[PDB]
Amino acid sequence: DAEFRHDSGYEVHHQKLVFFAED
Ligand SMILES: [Cu+2]
């Protein structure tokens, strides 16, 4: 997620989805 842009791209998903990689 890049509304909640931890990384602004598409991988390290901190926030909302909690899919695998984070912060
Ligand atoms: Cu994200």
Q: Please give the distance, rounded to the nearest whole angstrom, from the Cα atom of residue 12 to the centre of ligand 1.
A: 6
To which residue do tokens 């909690």 refer?
18
Q: Please give the distance, rounded to the nearest whole angstrom, from the Cα atom of residue 13 to the centre of ligand 1.
A: 4
Q: Please give the distance, rounded to the nearest whole angstrom, from the Cα atom of residue 20 to the centre of ligand 1.
A: 10
Asked if 13 and 2 count as a contact pair (C-beta separation under 8 A), the reply is no
To which residue do tokens 């991988």 refer?
11
Question: What's the start-to-end Cα distance of the chain, in Å?
Answer: 12
Rounded distance, CA 7 to CA 17, Å?
14
Residues 6+ apart with CB under 8 A from 3: none
Asked if 14 and 4 count as a contact pair (C-beta separation under 8 A), the reply is yes
Rounded distance, CA 3 to CA 11, Å?
13
Expt. technique = NMR
How many residues can be counted in the chain? 23
The CA-based angle 15-18-13, given to 5 degrees, is: 55
Residues 6+ apart with CB under 8 A from 14: 4, 6, 7, 22, 23
Exposure string (b/e) for 2-21, b if CB count within 10 Å is 16 or more? eeeebeeeeeebeeeeeeee
